[PDB]
Subunit: 227 residues, 2 copies
C-alpha cells in the first residue's frame, strides 16, 4: 500500500565553478541530497595531498552510500614550457583535476551504491597534443587515462557501477563570454544541457559503456553526447 | 692547427635509481660533464612544487648550456582505486615522473643547446589502461602526452632540439631479480643497453622524430628501440 523510498546522495566536487553551480542546481531540482565537499567555498585546501582529499571526501559522506560521485572541478591556464609560470599553473591543474579524481575514485569504490556513477571531467582538446596548453592538456589527458583504467577492473567498483569522463569542447560560461565577446556561440555548450545529462546518467539511464570518453558536441546550438 | 673543443653537459634527473646510475656511468665513460641534481642523494626534496624543482634545476646548471636533459627518475608502486594507499603512492609517482618532467622541460627550453636532447621516461605498459597500477600508469601516460605536446611546438625548444620518451617493458634491475627470482630474463632489457642508447642520442645520431614514444623491446636477450 505505502512503500517508503530513500534519498539519492551525490558527492559533488567542484561546486563553486560555473559547471559546478549548474550541476548543483540540476541535482537540487531533481530532489537529490547534495554533499558539496568544496563548500561551507574553498572549503578543502587546494594544497591538500591526494590522501588528505580522500580523507576530506570520506569524512563529508560518513554513514551515507553515494549513488553518484561527480567531479567537475578545474580551471584553465595557458602556457608553453617556455613560460616560467607553466610550472605553478600545471601543478594547480593537476591538483584540481587529477588529485581530486584519484581521491574521488577511492570514495566511489568504498562508499558507492550498486549501479552508482563516477563522473570525471576531461577535455576534447586533450585528445591531441596541446603545445600551448601544456598543464591543462596533460592534466585532462591523465583524467581520460584514469577513467579508462578504473573502468578496466569492475571488481573494485560497486556492482553495475559506471565510470564516465565528459570531454567538453567549449562551454557557454561567463569567462568564455568576456574572453571572446564578439565570437559565434553556436558551438558553445549550455551549462544546463551538461548538468541535465549528468543528472540523467546519475538516475541510471542512457549511460554509454563504463570507461567511455563522452565528447560534448554542440552544432547550431544543439548538443550531442558522443562516444 | 689546434682547435679547442668544449665539454658537453648533461643535466641528469634520477641519478640514484638503477637506470640513473647506469646512465651516469655511460655519460662518464663518454667524457661528458654530469650535473646530477638529485645528488650531494635525495638532494632535492620530493615534496618540492614544480616551481621549486625548476628553481633547483636552473640553479644546478647556472652559466652552462646543457646539450642533454635526461629524466630517468621514478619508482614503481601497485594499487587499484580500492586500496587507501593508492592516493599516497600515486601522488609520489606523479611527483617523481611528471612534476620532474615539467620542470626539466622548462630548463631544457631556457638553458638547452641547439641540437640538444630532452629525454623523458614513460612505460610501455601505460600505452593501455592499467587497472592494477593506477598511479604508475596515470603518471607515465601523462609523461607520454607531455613529450608529444612539447615536440608539437618546436619554436620554444633550441634549434634542431629533439624530445623523446623511452617506454621500457621490463628492465634487468636488482629489484626485478629479487621480486621474480625464477623467471626467464630473456625479455629483460640490460640497463647498459638503455644507457648506451641514451648517450648515442645525446651525442646527436640515430634520433627518431621529435615527440617519439620509443618502446624498448628485448627478445632472446637482444634489444631494439622501436617507434
Amino acid at each position: 500500500l505505502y512503500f517508503q523510498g530513500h534519498m539519492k546522495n551525490v558527492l559533488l566536487i567542484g561546486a563553486c565553478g560555473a559547471l559546478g553551480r549548474a550541476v548543483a542546481n540540476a541535482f537540487a531540482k531533481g530532489k537529490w541530497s547534495i554533499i558539496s565537499v568544496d563548500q561551507a567555498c574553498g572549503a578543502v585546501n587546494p594544497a591538500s595531498s591526494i590522501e588528505e582529499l580522500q580523507q576530506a571526501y570520506k569524512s563529508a559522506v560518513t554513514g551515507l552510500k553515494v549513488d553518484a560521485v561527480i567531479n567537475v572541478a578545474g580551471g584553465w591556464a595557458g602556457g608553453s614550457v617556455a613560460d616560467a609560470r607553466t610550472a605553478a599553473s600545471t601543478e594547480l591543474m593537476l591538483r584540481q583535476s587529477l588529485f581530486s579524481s584519484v581521491a574521488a575514485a577511492h570514495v566511489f569504490s568504498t562508499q558507492g551504491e550498486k549501479d552508482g556513477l563516477l563522473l570525471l571531467t576531461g577535455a576534447a582538446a586533450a585528445l591531441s597534443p596541446t603545445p600551448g596548453m601544456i598543464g591543462y592538456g596533460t592534466a585532462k589527458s591523465a583524467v581520460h587515462f584514469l577513467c579508462q583504467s578504473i573502468a578496466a577492473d569492475p571488481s573494485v567498483l560497486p556492482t553495475d557501477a559506471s565510470v564516465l569522463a565528459i570531454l567538453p569542447t567549449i562551454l557557454d560560461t561567463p569567462g568564455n563570454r568576456s574572453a571572446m565577446p564578439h565570437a559565434d556561440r553556436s558551438t558553445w555548450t549550455s551549462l544546463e544541457d551538461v548538468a541535465q545529462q549528468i543528472v540523467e546518467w546519475s538516475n541510471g539511464s542512457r549511460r554509454p559503456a563504463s570507461g567511455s570518453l563522452v565528447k560534448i558536441v554542440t552544432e547550431n546550438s544543439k548538443t550531442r553526447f558522443i562516444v
